[PDB]
Assembly symmetry: D2
Homo-oligomer: 131 residues x 4
């Protein structure tokens, strides 16, 4: 017979999403496990940013989080937060904007870049069947 929609099943199916290209691209080779996971967590927070009207003039969605709050969100210490921020920033996955004395710093999460090698590798992985 049919099954109900259950709250247990609903929360079993909630995820943090790490882009597959983080595992194929040479550009994202330097990323640590924490950097990848933190990137996924921030993406889920993107939906929170849309609720906060944290959308700029061009429709770009951003974060207005203090380092303390980011430490809370990512469950990490201060040094780790700095290392993660730098790692993502250097790979072009995070952009930091300063708005001056009047305002707190803005954080922009960025989509990854995908090359033909990445596409080939992901296709290869996603269609690896047998015999």
């Amino acid at each position: 017979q049919n099954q109900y929609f259950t709250v247990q099943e609903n929360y079993k199916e909630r995820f943090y999403q790490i882009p597959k290209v983080f595992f194929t691209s040479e550009n994202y080779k330097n990323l640590t496990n924490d950097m990848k996971i933190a990137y996924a967590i921030l993406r889920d927070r993107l939906n929170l940013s849309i609720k906060n009207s944290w959308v700029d003039e061009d429709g770009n969605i951003y974060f207005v989080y203090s380092n303390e709050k980011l430490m809370e969100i990512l469950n990490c210490k201060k040094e780790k937060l700095t290392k993660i921020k730098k790692g993502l920033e250097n790979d072009g996955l995070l952009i930091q904007k300063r708005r001056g004395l009047n305002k707190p710093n803005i954080l922009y999460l960025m989509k990854p870049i995908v090359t033909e090698r990445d596409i080939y590798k992901i296709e290869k992985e996603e269609n690896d069947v047998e015999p």
Copy 2:
């Protein structure tokens, strides 16, 4: 270069989901286009029901909607609402519970049933490549 996460892109990627089995199974052959679409719309509302604490003792998620409200949600007239409700109910996709004089009627959306024929047909469709 990298792209921002944009609110436009976010809302471009919001969907109503119709189960693929609605198009393969003999049991769901009788369903009209409106029944299928209404089923998808109610599923998105499932997330609203979790926010409303519309979860019963066994964790089953339900609706507490009046016919007027359902008419608003589904954008349909009264006769259409009745036809949709009956069609889904007869196919086991909707269960209606009466709680008496004290309370308004409860609606339970149900997951579809999938048979081996359904699985075969969906596999066939999802892997229909060439040459």
Copy 3:
């Protein structure tokens, strides 16, 4: 603990209709068949990537015969033409003709989202209670 089951896997396979099809004044003219056919073709986008149906700029397209499209959409020829035209008029489909012998190249298009669309979808998605 629970297993991953094939029934649960195929229970969770869907055809996805963009919510804006129900909010925008622009897509008001679309019939139910047009909306569903659009959802079905999008799923087929994944098949097109497997078929190397990708142009120079990375745009994904279809090169299906009308008979094939009739099979995919489970419709007769008249219905197919009506659907193609309906989607085309709303900018959701671009059709290129390669002549009598060959099938048309079809480009499925993303819909347009306006602030009114965004507001109404926000309204729907947060339609909560005390």
Copy 4:
């Protein structure tokens, strides 16, 4: 209007880690490698359905050699054993041994969700502002 592009398609391919891995006291012991490896194997669940790796009750399983698992997880043997054991202890993996000649049958398992998990995830998912 915009095209569907292959870059955008593969930009949107992910490995999914259950949120409860970060809230539950039960999964606190899991390392980052264990969580990621779990996400990767889940994606492989779709490959198992294609391989007819489905048992009598519809449960999806893996029959990959340790060399193959090492390739999939991009790890050495010691790491693989540590990951398998770590997932196994938390009930996220069931391992059946078919002897010296053959690879182990592996059942990936869904996690357990408690009310504390649900509450914390609700708290996270609705962490809004004025």
